[PDB]
Amino acid sequence: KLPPVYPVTVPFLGHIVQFGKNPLEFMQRCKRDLKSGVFTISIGGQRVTIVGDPHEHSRFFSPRNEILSPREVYTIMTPVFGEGVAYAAPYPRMREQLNFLAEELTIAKFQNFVPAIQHEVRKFMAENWKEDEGVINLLEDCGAMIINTACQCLFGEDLRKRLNARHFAQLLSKMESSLIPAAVFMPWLLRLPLPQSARCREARAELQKILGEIIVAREKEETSDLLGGLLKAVYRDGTRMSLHEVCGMIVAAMFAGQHTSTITTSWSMLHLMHPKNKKWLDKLHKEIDEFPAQLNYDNVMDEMPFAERCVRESIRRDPPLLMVMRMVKAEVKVGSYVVPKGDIIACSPLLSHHDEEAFPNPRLWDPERDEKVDGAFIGFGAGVHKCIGQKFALLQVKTILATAFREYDFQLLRDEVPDPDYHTMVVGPTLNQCLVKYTRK
Ligand code: HEM
Ligand SMILES: O=C(N[C@H](Cc1c[nH]c2ccccc12)C(=O)Nc1ccncc1)c1ccc(-c2cccc(F)c2)cc1F
């Protein structure tokens, strides 16, 4: 039982085009006009099957790569993380590799983090929000704090000194400068692509070059950072990581967070400041108002369940990553239908999070809601490939919120909360809507 196919009106580009303008509405359209939402868009002549049903998510996450591999679809990353580094490494290694990062971003590895990140914020604002009140772009400053903060946590002083955040940021940016989201048909498209790499690849090298130097430098003198920790790692056979792979994993760490976290932090501030949500804002404050000026792990990790709620909804309502794809290397059965081998198969947070059965009044941002279908919230993916940085991210967000709101109040210079800008790789509030006003308490 092949799933319905939205008929293709213009031979080569219509869906890719139609999705670009309004994917949510587009996708829903197929759900709507084919009745049963396990449809199959065609993108480039690639049959693409979207699993639109919360109930049948489980089928999307669970099958192991040898049945549903992202290695094929995410190939575009390969210049960035490095040849053989991640999805470009056979699954024993990839799994091994990913597993090592995860172990660096575990809640154990956070003992000292909160003040570090809490610092950078108090530092940043003070430096960029001098006046009692002023006007700033929110997206950007969240963007600056996110990056800034991560570095404070995940990188050592020598290292931080040798390559400061701003430079990283530019470094990182050059790397997406490469990226082209063909992922839906992306794999095949790789014929002789222009060195979109050329800009980035240089960037990877410069990072690596640096990374070596600290290692060389550090060892001379006589250490627990992200770099330090990855080096200690050993594969199951018993080989260590090659700084090439080390450099890649670090890139992954900075890469995943940069937009998703920024967008998340931002939305969350955006919704909380808005006047509709006074109620929620007051709730937060009771939560955070007795927190000691100095902030420590426990306040954030343990004593902030609501705030977490707020972040999760923000992601739930407008998730940064619109969808997830796997390459079907074997025929598999989703509910009634069956999906061909060789059909790229995708699952979308953006859609499932607006299925009205599981998220009714999806556009209402309620931090206190709870999914009415399990695994409907997939903002951080699910099953095998669960996000491995989410705990870290949340940590970042919840701290920025407590710190910012605690000493500031914000006024949204737009009548309504912004509109999502879908014209980006990772989807966020529109940069222009984001103007926002701040008043030192
Ligand atoms: C707001 C922040 C974030 C959001 C919303 C987010 C969301 C997600 C989602 C939905 C997935 C599943 C993608 C898929 O199944 O292909 C995922 C996977 C992943 N995320 Fe994140 N993520 C975030 C932050 C991070 C950070 C900071 C890291 C840092 C390393 C990270 C690393 C990963 C990795 C490695 C995977 C892949 C799991 C695998 O391939 O097995 N993420 N993330
Ligand atoms: O920007 C993207 N991907 C980036 C880099 C990245 C790719 N594979 C990863 C696996 C782990 C970590 C990072 C990445 C990333 O950072 N993703 C990420 C994933 C998990 N956690 C954190 C971050 C990206 C965004 C959108 C689309 C897209 C959406 C809808 C339709 C469509 F056709 C394309 C595709 C994208 F490739």
Side-chain angles (χ1 to χ4, degrees), residues 2-7 9-11 14-15 20 22-24 26-61 63-70 72-90 92-106 108-110 112-122 124-129 133-146 148-160 162-176 178 181-185 187-188 190 193 195 197-198 200-219 222 224-239 241-275 277-332 334-371 373-385 387-436 438-439 441:
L2 275 146
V5 171
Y6 204 48
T9 5
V10 24
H15 300 66
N22 199 153
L24 167 59
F26 166 39
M27 291 212 269
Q28 272 175 326
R29 198 154 311 131
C30 318
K31 200 173 187 184
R32 201 165 272 20
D33 304 358
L34 329 108
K35 304 301 176 37
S36 218
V38 187
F39 36 107
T40 296
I41 265 62
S42 163
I43 289 309
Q46 253 300 337
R47 240 170 184 157
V48 181
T49 300
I50 284 180
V51 185
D53 205 318
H55 297 266
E56 306 284 281
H57 277 161
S58 359
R59 323 308 142 108
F60 188 77
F61 329 96
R64 280 211 195 193
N65 313 281
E66 326 92 12
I67 325 299
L68 287 176
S69 75
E72 277 91 345
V73 302
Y74 289 158
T75 159
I76 178 54
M77 302 297 316
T78 303
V80 178
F81 300 157
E83 268 227 340
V85 176
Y87 295 101
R93 279 185 85 101
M94 176 191 104
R95 206 153 57 111
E96 283 234 58
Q97 266 152 325
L98 287 177
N99 170 45
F100 290 159
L101 183 67
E103 271 171 4
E104 295 310 315
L105 306 178
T106 62
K109 307 312 262 86
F110 300 160
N112 264 327
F113 277 12
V114 195
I117 108 86
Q118 171 142 72
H119 173 92
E120 269 296 331
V121 175
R122 293 216 232 257
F124 171 98
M125 323 189 288
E127 309 215 313
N128 308 248
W129 306 348
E133 13 159 14
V135 176
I136 59 149
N137 192 129
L138 190 64
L139 206 47
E140 303 192 334
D141 302 39
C142 288
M145 292 183 268
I146 283 291
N148 284 17
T149 24
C151 290
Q152 225 56 51
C153 305
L154 303 180
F155 293 118
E157 197 203 316
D158 44 332
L159 172 31
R160 247 137 49 184
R162 180 91 185 65
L163 161 103
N164 72 355
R166 215 188 332 268
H167 194 204
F168 220 144
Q170 301 172 342
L171 256 183
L172 276 166
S173 315
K174 264 113 98 188
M175 290 185 252
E176 357 187 10
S178 163
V184 266
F185 77 61
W188 103 62
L190 285 64
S197 72
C200 87
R201 203 224 357 96
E202 163 176 335
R204 208 221 193 265
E206 169 183 346
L207 176 51
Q208 220 176 100
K209 207 146 80 225
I210 308 199
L211 279 165
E213 298 177 15
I214 306 290
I215 298 188
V216 169
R218 294 177 147 159
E219 166 57 334
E222 147 246 297
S224 316
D225 49 354
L226 184 71
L227 169 80
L230 293 155
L231 275 63
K232 285 178 213 163
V234 193
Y235 287 132
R236 254 161 36 236
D237 65 30
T239 343
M241 279 184 294
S242 67
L243 129 156
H244 178 93
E245 323 198 316
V246 167
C247 154
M249 285 292 108
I250 296 195
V251 174
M254 301 310 282
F255 216 91
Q258 63 172 11
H259 292 163
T260 36
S261 299
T262 301
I263 291 174
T264 292
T265 301
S266 330
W267 267 134
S268 329
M269 309 198 73
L270 288 186
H271 294 280
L272 275 199
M273 37 171 40
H274 178 302
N277 301 324
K278 197 262 200 304
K279 170 157 203 291
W280 298 136
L281 194 83
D282 300 25
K283 180 149 189 173
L284 167 56
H285 273 280
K286 281 310 107 50
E287 167 156 297
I288 75 186
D289 273 25
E290 315 92 13
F291 280 169
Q294 256 303 99
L295 268 201
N296 51 223
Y297 160 119
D298 303 359
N299 324 312
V300 188
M301 227 60 256
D302 305 332
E303 283 162 47
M304 287 195 148
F306 184 52
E308 204 158 335
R309 278 248 184 202
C310 287
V311 177
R312 181 148 21 238
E313 190 44 9
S314 336
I315 309 164
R316 190 287 299 179
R317 177 160 123 62
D318 329 67
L321 291 151
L322 302 202
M323 77 171 48
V324 169
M325 315 48 107
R326 304 267 179 278
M327 171 70 86
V328 202
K329 291 248 290 180
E331 132 140 52
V332 46
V334 196
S336 85
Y337 305 100
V338 174
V339 177
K341 191 190 171 217
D343 233 43
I344 285 182
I345 170 189
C347 203
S348 177
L350 176 67
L351 172 27
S352 313
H353 292 190
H354 302 83
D355 164 280
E356 277 114 304
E357 167 206 12
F359 301 94
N361 187 352
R363 296 310 261 171
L364 167 48
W365 177 85
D366 176 323
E368 212 99 51
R369 72 151 87 216
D370 286 344
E371 25 148 56
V373 191
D374 307 25
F377 182 83
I378 52 181
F380 286 123
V384 166
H385 317 276
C387 192
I388 64 185
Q390 75 171 94
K391 293 304 183 300
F392 173 58
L394 292 136
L395 175 92
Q396 256 189 318
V397 182
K398 289 159 68 162
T399 299
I400 289 158
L401 298 193
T403 288
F405 281 115
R406 193 78 204 297
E407 15 205 313
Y408 280 70
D409 247 282
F410 296 87
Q411 220 257 308
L412 170 50
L413 317 176
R414 177 153 182 299
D415 224 352
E416 309 292 81
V417 185
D419 276 294
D421 190 5
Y422 292 101
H423 298 344
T424 17
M425 180 136 278
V426 178
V427 188
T430 300
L431 177 47
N432 20 305
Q433 319 249 356
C434 280
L435 268 139
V436 160
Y438 76 89
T439 327
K441 255 171 189 90

